Structure formats: C-alpha cells, structure tokens
C-alpha cells in the first residue's frame, strides 16, 4: 500500500485487505 501508485477499483478491492478491520464508511464516490 504505502507510497505506491496502484490505481482504479483494484485499490477499492485491496482497501478491504489493507484497512481490514471495521467494515468502512468510504464516501468520496467509490473509486472506479
């Protein structure tokens, strides 16, 4: 994750593997 330029919904899908714990609010649209 940290300081690398991985882009589009593969970082939305990886956000559930990276932030991980809570199950999240995530409001800035959803990143298509």
């Amino acid at each position: 994750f940290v300081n690398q330029h991985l882009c589009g919904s593969h970082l939305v899908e990886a956000l559930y593997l990276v932030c991980g714990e809570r199950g999240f609010f995530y409001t800035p649209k959803t990143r298509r």
Partner: peptide, 21 residues
Amino acid sequence: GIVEQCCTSICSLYQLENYCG
C-alpha cells in the same frame, strides 16, 4: 479522494483514515 490521490501523488494511511471510518 484517496485512490485519486494515490494515482497522481504520494499516499499514506492518514488518507485511508480520511475515508475508512
């Protein structure tokens, strides 16, 4: 938003906590 910021520039866990509530 966080992934737009990661596509253009540097990206940190502080920008995760900005939207990962």
